[PDB]
Design a protein around this ligand. Structure first.
Ligand code: PBU
Length: 131
């Protein structure tokens, strides 16, 4: 339907620029795109949503409230989508890391504000891994 492509010409180039990691050497490729699509179809979501910045936003917003009841399988998607979505809004984050902060910071402002005390505190962070 009217060229079922995720990223256009100018977008494709920039896409290849961004990398999976900030201090890595592995850049983004079509694999990372088509991949998320093959998975979306499993999450009751069409891969066509990636053919529109407006849609890429709904994806992150949908899985957002599901990031709690989901494993890495959903964590990886959010990452990729974050980079792609940015591309459409004319963004080329230095890495998949700057992409998550650019979308998280917007929400952090409200968090650190609403809390500004119960969202950090001093010493009170525990952790216990399994075997
Ligand atoms: C042909 C097979 C299908 C295909 O094209 O699949 C494309 C990929 C899976 O294959 P891959 O690209 O080799 O896998 C990635 C690399 O090893 C990368 O170095 C690693 O980063 P780090 O985090 O360890 O530094 C990633 O780790 P997490 O994302 O699990 O953390 C890992 O997924 O699907 C995805 O999930 C990409 C999501 C961005």
């Amino acid at each position: 339907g009217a060229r079922a492509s995720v990223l256009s010409g100018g977008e494709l180039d920039k896409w290849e620029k961004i990398r999976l990691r900030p201090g890595g050497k592995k850049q983004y490729k079509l694999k990372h795109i088509v991949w998320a699509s093959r998975e979306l179809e499993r999450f009751a979501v069409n891969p066509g949503l990636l053919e529109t910045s407006e849609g890429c936003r709904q994806i992150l917003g949908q899985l957002q409230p599901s990031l709690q009841t989901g494993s890495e399988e959903l964590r990886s998607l959010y990452n990729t989508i974050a980079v792609l979505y940015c591309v459409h809004q004319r963004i080329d984050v230095k890495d998949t890391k700057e992409a998550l902060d650019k979308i998280e910071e917007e929400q952090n402002k409200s968090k650190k504000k609403a809390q500004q005390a119960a969202a950090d505190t001093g010493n009170n962070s525990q952790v216990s891994q399994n075997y």
